[PDB]
Design a protein around this ligand. Structure first.
Ligand SMILES: NC(=O)c1ccc[n+]([C@@H]2O[C@H](COP(=O)([O-])OP(=O)(O)OC[C@H]3O[C@@H](n4cnc5c(N)ncnc54)[C@H](OP(=O)(O)O)[C@@H]3O)[C@@H](O)[C@H]2O)c1
Ligand SMILES: NC(=O)c1ccc[n+]([C@@H]2O[C@H](COP(=O)([O-])OP(=O)(O)OC[C@H]3O[C@@H](n4cnc5c(N)ncnc54)[C@H](OP(=O)(O)O)[C@@H]3O)[C@@H](O)[C@H]2O)c1
Lengths: 373, 372
């Protein structure tokens, strides 16, 4: 018996990464897929991975959803907020796998990142937990890299200064970033094409372009191309942004910690497509040798990598260009810092759409399939 | 009388910012300027500020240099290494003001950031110091923002994760960054113009372009447009980069600390033109109320500015777009961090060519004209 799996939000950005990865892993050999839609119910459904499906079903139709053993949705928080309470109200016994943050902090939900917390997931399955949610991209990517330090309870606290890509804000924000790159270059091309032009003239024109009415910044509100934005998501009364607030609460929930490990920092948007990078100050509980720290990271999971702390390796392997569209999570610049042997610096890069979004969800689906077979 | 000032490296990027600032401040009105060249000796000299000067003099000719009361050079470390020892050996009694890092860590030299260490500069001038050197751009910009915390002896240590602009590497690096932005957009433009294009197609195309032979990365070595580079300058034995190593030694020399305050972090290059930003974890020696920390920053100098910790103000005032080409050094996101009330987070942005390069040098020159 293959589980009946309902796919919602398969068409969007996160959903399309999920579909691609499910095809790459032949995930459809092990399930019976049913495709749902909020806009095209009745239309022809995709045939990813060589499996046909009936016509698109209404994503908001509770009776249709109750037919599934598993719902995996990349549709969004507004969808989950409407549909999830109605579906659970029917007594529906199935599993809900969600990319949206809506249910992340509810008592009945487990945040999934199985290379780090498989034990939490399996303990939850045995307890009857039915709802499984991806974590925030910044937390998931950081834990894929240095989570072994937390699992071994070596971390007293951590600050994280991030370099976040436009993909976290959405497909249209990525397109805006690229369009702004073109706006800056194409309107300074006549100066740039002349070797004898003055750099200060080129620079003056770029600043005028960034500051002018013509710059395309509808989605970010301010320019990103050629700049950065040191604020992501809503303002909290504490002065934290909501993006920054997720660090401590989601990290400690993924790990199952009862004693909270403090995590804080600044989440800053930069002009990258879909890789988040993070500069970490990690206070350790003892003077752990650097080679043992590297071994713990290397051995923690398949995807974490240690980049040797050299100029050449850092430039080639520890960048968004090295990582984008891969599942690799490099950790580099690993060094004890000047203020003491217990201060560990680390710099890590991860793809936001994979480990930061779609990949923990398809891996949770395979865990379920194996669990229920 | 009006001192005779020899200007070296006035033609380069830092020199050009310096000349513009001197014209803007009418600095040439109180000096007699003389222009030197490494490539165009004998040619007609510029006339910034409406002041004429004789033909361009040879920048490596010690006999010409000795006639100057001041030498202010933006030419580079290779220049300073060659010329400065030979000039001092002749007994030259003049002042040497330098953008290059060559002399920063010599005992006889003072690192100038007068809104922070004017007292160090005045004491050195009276003690006979004749060599004054601008600090590393990251250190100077950080101190212009949060230097008052150090002057009040409140900092136990600090980590600084930086977001450094292309200007720190050079004019050609800035041009390469813009050219790469155009390369990514123009070769993805057909996809971008179609609303129905799949974002994963657009994204696959950008990554291929960044990774291919056609991407222009001759100067940085790897792409910067749409990326970052977490390594700046030479690799040290400790694993620190030379850029990162500068933080602790330069900060403590600028301040005059005999007790070194530890400073460390990661220096990272991003795709900005000429503003450096820094995300700071500051461990304080005691629990200082946040509003008093703000007042320390406001009171420290007229260019530091406290940006209220709001989404709207951070987005519009605490960015390279807000700061570029100006003398403003905003400090924002000021907040006590989750690991305790002695932990202060801060985010600052500063123009790397002004306070990070040219501005401390022209202010030091005005200090000399006022002093003598
Ligand atoms: N964006 C991220 O990087 C990211 C990361 C982690 C988690 N998440 C969460 O994942 C959820 C979805 O994010 P997303 O960025 O993937 O959303 P999205 O691209 O905006 O897609 C969401 C839905 O919008 C509809 N849609 C409208 N026009 C579309 C078009 N031209 N192409 C494709 N779909 C279109 C589709 O629904 P129909 O097919 O029913 O019409 C699609 O499933 C949100 O809860 C978000 O918070 C996002
Ligand atoms: N780059 C920075 O952002 C920065 C920041 C702080 C400190 N500094 C220091 O300042 C020094 C110079 O930096 P820079 O970036 O200003 O150097 P630069 O633009 O390369 O200029 C240095 C010299 O190169 C010569 N040159 C060759 N081709 C040139 C051209 N097309 N246009 C203009 N000059 C040209 C000029 O000397 P001639 O007139 O004699 O031919 C010029 O004065 C170095 O010591 C550097 O470490 C730089």
């Amino acid at each position: 018996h293959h589980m009946k799996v309902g796919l919602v939000g398969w068409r969007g950005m996160v959903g399309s990464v999920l579909m691609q990865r499910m095809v790459e892993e032949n995930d459809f050999a092990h399930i019976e897929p049913f495709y749902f839609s909020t806009s095209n119910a009745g239309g022809e459904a995709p045939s990813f991975g060589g499996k046909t499906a009936p016509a698109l079903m209404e994503a908001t139709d509770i009776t249709s959803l109750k037919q599934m053993d598993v719902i995996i949705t990349c549709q969004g928080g507004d969808y989950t907020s409407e549909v999830f309470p109605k579906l659970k109200a029917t007594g529906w016994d199935g599993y809900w796998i969600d990319a949206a943050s809506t249910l992340r902090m509810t008592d009945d939900a487990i945040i999934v990142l199985d290379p780090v917390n498989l034990n939490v997931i399996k303990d939850g399955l045995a307890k009857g937990t039915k709802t499984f949610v991806g974590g925030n991209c910044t937390v998931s990517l950081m834990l894929m890299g240095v989570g072994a330090l937390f699992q071994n309870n070596l971390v007293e606290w951590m600050t994280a200064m991030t370099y976040q890509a436009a993909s976290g804000a959405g497909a249209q924000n990525m397109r805006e970033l690229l369009t702004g790159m073109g706006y800056l270059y194409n309107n300074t091309k006549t100066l740039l094409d002349d070797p004898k032009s003055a750099i200060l003239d080129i620079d003056r024109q770029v600043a005028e372009l960034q500051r002018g009415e013509g710059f395309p910044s509808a989605n970010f509100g301010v320019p990103l191309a050629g700049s950065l934005i040191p604020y992501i998501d809503k303002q909290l009364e504490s002065g934290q942004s909501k993006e920054e607030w997720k660090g401590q609460v989601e990290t400690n929930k993924i790990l199952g910690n009862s004693q909270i490990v403090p995590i804080d920092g600044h989440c800053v948007r930069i002009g990258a497509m879909r890789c988040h990078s993070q500069a970490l100050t990690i206070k350790l509980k003892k003077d752990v040798p650097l080679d043992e720290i590297e071994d713990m990271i290397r051995n923690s999971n398949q995807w974490a990598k240690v980049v040797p702390n050299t100029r050449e390796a850092s430039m080639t392997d520890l960048t968004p260009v090295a990582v984008t569209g891969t599942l690799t999570v490099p950790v580099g610049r690993l060094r004890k810092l000047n203020m003491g042997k217990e201060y560990l610096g680390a710099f890590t890069v991860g793809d936001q759409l994979l480990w930061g979004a779609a990949e923990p969800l398809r891996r949770m689906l395979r865990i379920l399939v194996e669990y229920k077979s």
